[PDB]
Amino acid sequence: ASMQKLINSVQNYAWGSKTALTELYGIANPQQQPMAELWMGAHPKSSSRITGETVSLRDAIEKNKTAMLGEAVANRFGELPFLFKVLCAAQPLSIQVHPNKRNSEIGFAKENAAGIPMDAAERNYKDPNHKPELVFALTPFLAMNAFREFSDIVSLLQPVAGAHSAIAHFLQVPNAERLSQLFASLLNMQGEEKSRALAVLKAALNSQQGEPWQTIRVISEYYPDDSGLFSPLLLNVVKLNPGEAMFLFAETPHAYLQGVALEVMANSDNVLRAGLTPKYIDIPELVANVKFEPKPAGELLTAPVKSGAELDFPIPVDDFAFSLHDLALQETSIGQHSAAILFCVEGEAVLRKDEQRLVLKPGESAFIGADESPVNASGTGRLARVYNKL
Template sequence: MFVPISNTPRDYAWGSTTALPELLGTPVTGRPQAELWLGAHAGSPSRILDPDDTGGAEDLAAWIAADPATTLGGDRRGDTLPFLLKLLAASEPLSLQAHPTLERARAGFERENAEGVPLDAPNRNYKDALHKPEIVVALSDRYEALCGFRPLAEVREIIDLLVTIDNSQTAPRWELYGPMVHLLEDSGTERETDAEILRSVVAWVLSGGEEVQTLVGHLVRTAEKALHPAHAHMTDPYTPSLETVVMLQEEYPGDPGIIISLLLNRVALRAGEALYLPAGNIHAYLRGVGIELMAASDNVLRGGLTPKHVDVPELLEVLEFHPLPVPYLVPSHPAAGVSVFRPDVDDFELVRVEAVSGAEPIGLSPAGPAIVLCLSGTLTVAGGADDAVLVRGGAVYVTPDEGRLYFTGEGVAFVAAPGARSE
């Protein structure tokens, strides 16, 4: 079956008022349209456009619960859809955050249940027993993000740069930077590894207090000074990181996350480039339009740039502190017009299909149920028993019995499905 689905965009304050309407060809409402969810997550399950197709079920979660054999298939891995597809349009930075491993999510969910913490409590960390790895593919010309801890050598260079530019200071740098002086010392010794240094610095920053607030103010003032054209020859290639400090101060004045931003890789994706963010990778999307695919979880541990709950001890246990390269996810191209973004988990994979009029049909074989979202042009999608015509902004849920799918027409679509099972 091909079942047309839709949803109402989430109006989070950081969302763009125009980007999703421009992408999907939908009306501008005057309110932020931050995320469009396509899936069966209880927080915003997709709406069934014609409930007569689904025995009266009005949303995807209800239909799956009523008929898992049809909706998920006879060889399903569980009785819920394992992935959630989102369109995201950020005009302001999102919170610094990380997601737990499957084992930690299960333990945390059971612990908070045993403690009687309500699922909707603002101090609840674990809303379910699932992990939440995710990928994001840039749709806008630039998609900017912070992700993962950068090498300590780069952090030292940034701090030394700021100390050099701030020639008005009278106090030694270790008095200004407090425990961050560890970043200017040799690491990799028996005393402290790079990961241990980063952990101690993040713990100190998130502890708050007068020293941290003083450092935030000092960093912002020095970054503003460093961005003066007179210092351009000194700040490259760290200009984007310094600009981020100033931008975050405008959005979240005095937030300790401003300091943490300097510890992280600063990324600007071009359209079509992707990141994969596994468990423990601290990240924050800054601005841009992208398509996300993730495990169907709502477990988020926040680390700043937010008025929401920040559980410092739990976050410190979840974070991966080892410096890592930018986690680019390079797609494979098994056929013309096909780009497959496949992470190292089997919860999901994302495929970009670009069909050209008059060309041979493009064939895909999803490993289970699929969601197809058309982002441009007009496409016909045909399976073993059914088909659908999609125009820009249109989406369908495809049941597994359709088997191999064939795309014809002129346009671009993304297909979300479970990943191939691990052997």
């Protein structure tokens, strides 16, 4: 078929919502398992499938790379260069940093030389490149992203100046070097040093109102003994309205705290943890991979561009592109020179290719091979597309 309706994997990670995908999309969950991620793509660990027998989308692409992916993508990447997820964060998730291109090459090589299997838990670097990443809110979405302006951090730390000398040290000279030292010191707190700092913070949670104190309170219910409880004082806390997006830069701490979002990423990721985790953190390595530069709140959301019915979220990389398409009862053409995945965000989409018609209800998606572009879309609501602009 010109258009293939996707059968998609749901990862039942412990932190997933037992209800979100069901409430939003009618996805069946009689056993009430947590449903953390809905995967749309051709990841080797759990590829989407297409149908008349059921086959792996990854296997299908592999047998016909130029036709399915297009020449550009078959040339540059040799596979589907993106994985498209719905993320349902029912609990706050760990603070993460993605290393830059240079350090990714190094860490990938270190782990390869040490013989760490690629799918081992210990494995942090799975790509010799820095892989860019876009998050797009489906429901209101609470997250952290990047360091706040220094004067903001100063105001926020004053109520907890006594928690640790590193905090006092930073307040004395609020610069990048001392921000770095503060971040390392907080992460390295041990025993009674750590418990003292946490007791100061929790006392502050009784006499401070509103954000980011409220976010700290929320996080403390899941990570009551974590030095990452200080992080909303250092990192921008953001509440994305549905339809807003952020592009996560290298060397920049971020965390997803609550809500449902679409995420576009490469198949293989590099991740260093920076708090909100029971796992070991190599602090020197983390610190060597973080850029201690503020990012102003006005710069956090990616600014999309509307042209006709299309809203593009321009991304500073070749690997993938992301757009939203307003559906109308009159057809519009959606074309690209690559493979595309189309996902019904809301309303209902009818896709047409010549004589073939395919209906997607919210939460459903289709794969369109490069050879099959363009398709005509009509209906109501919005269709999200991941594809490649090359």
